[PDB]
Amino acid sequence: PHRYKPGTVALREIRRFQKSTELLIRKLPFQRLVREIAQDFKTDLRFQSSAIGALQESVEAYLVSLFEDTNLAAIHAKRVTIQKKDIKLARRLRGER
C-alpha cells in the first residue's frame, strides 16, 4: 500500500473530470429536488423529462460559473482553501440578485 503526497492528486482529478463531460449530478435526486421545490409555491403540476433535464443543465452551468470565479476570488487573497467570504464576495460581484 504505497500512496504518496496528497494535493497533486487533486490536480490529476482536476484534469480527470474536466476532460469528461458527463452530466455530473444525479438524476432522481434532482427529480425529487425540483418537484419538492415546485409543488409548494404553485400547486400540483406535472413535468416532462427533457424540460427537467434542461433545467438542471441550467443549474449546473450557473453554479459551475459561480464557483470558478469564486476560486479566482479566493486566490486573490493568496490562499488555497475555499471559505465563505470568498463565496459571498463572489455572489456580490456577480450582481447580488
Partner: peptide, 12 residues
C-alpha cells in the same frame, strides 16, 4: 451556454 459541453481547462 451549452447542453453538456465542458470547459477549456486551466489552473492558477
Amino acid at each position: 451556454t451549452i447542453a453538456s459541453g465542458g470547459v477549456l481547462p486551466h489552473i492558477n
